[PDB]
Amino acid sequence: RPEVIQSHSIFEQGPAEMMKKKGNWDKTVDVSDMGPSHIINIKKEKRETDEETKQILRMLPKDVSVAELLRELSLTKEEELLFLQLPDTLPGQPPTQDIAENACTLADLTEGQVGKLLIRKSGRVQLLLGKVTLDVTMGTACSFLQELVSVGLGDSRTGEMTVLGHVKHKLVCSPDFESLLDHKHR
């Protein structure tokens, strides 16, 4: 192990560093694309950040309900699936279900038109539903894969399973409490 060393501090060249590093890392052997050495560019490893799964290449943005639906209808006009959440009980009542005040849910409602969805100036939204209004807001952003499937129990022995599509976004519906308080003073 050496002990007597002459230190150096006079300025040196940058491109010298660059050229030396080039010589130490630019002697590529990427041409070694043998049969056993092939990779599927789709089958690459992944960044933990699902939004940034771009660790090695080949060489979420703020959003609001009004802008999201505007994008969904103007720029593109194809079919789309959404996964939305509703309050515990809807403003209806059971349809002669014989009744505890059991909760009124979409599962216990008849088909047909049920309400209207309104976009107003300044970019806030309500679901006009009968004589009440439910506010609509964006949920938590989604990045993992979700698939919408329909399970048909065609027979007690066996059935069939068909994929419909993949979901991309979430919506949340909440009662407008201060509006209810203002209408019915207490």
Partner 1 sequence: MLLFCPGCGNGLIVEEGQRCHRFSCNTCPYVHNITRKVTNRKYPKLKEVDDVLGGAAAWENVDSTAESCPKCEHPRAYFMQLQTRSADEPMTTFYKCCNAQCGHRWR
Partner 2 sequence: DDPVVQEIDVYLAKSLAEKLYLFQYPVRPASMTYDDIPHLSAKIKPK
Instruction: Return residues touching partner 1 (CB under 8 A).
Output: 6-9, 25, 28-30, 32-34, 36-37, 39, 43-48, 55-56
**DSSP class per residue in 62-100:** ---HHHHHHHHHTT--S----EEE--SS-SS--SS----
Using CA atoms, how far residue 143 sits from 48, 148, 176, in Å, is: 11, 15, 29
Question: HSE on the CB side for 163, CA within 13 Å?
Answer: 5
| Nearest CA among 154, 168, 176, 183 for reference residue 63 | 168
Contact residues for partner 2, defined by CB under 8 A: 42, 46, 50, 53, 69-70, 73, 83, 106-107, 109-122, 124, 127, 142-153, 161, 163, 166-168
Smallest gap, in angstroms, from Cβ of residue 36 to partner 1? 7
Comparing CB distances to partner 1, the nearer of 22 and 116 is 22
Q: Which pair of structure tokens corresponds to residue 56?
A: 């090695």
* Partner in contact with 132, chosen from partner 1, partner 2, none, beta carbon below 5 to 8 Å by kind: none
* Partner in contact with 48, chosen from partner 2, partner 1, none, beta carbon below 5 to 8 Å by kind: partner 1
Q: Position of tokens 């949920």?
A: 139
Smallest gap, in angstroms, from Cβ of residue 104 to partner 2? 13
Comparing CB distances to partner 1, the nearer of 48 and 182 is 48
Smallest gap, in angstroms, from Cβ of residue 74 to partner 1? 35
Comparing CB distances to partner 2, the nearer of 17 and 51 is 51
Phi then psi for 14, rounded to 5 degrees?
A: -80, -60
* Partner in contact with 39, chosen from partner 2, partner 1, none, beta carbon below 5 to 8 Å by kind: partner 1
Give the burial string for 60-77 (b: 16+ CB within 10 Å, else e).
eeeeebeeebeeeeeeee
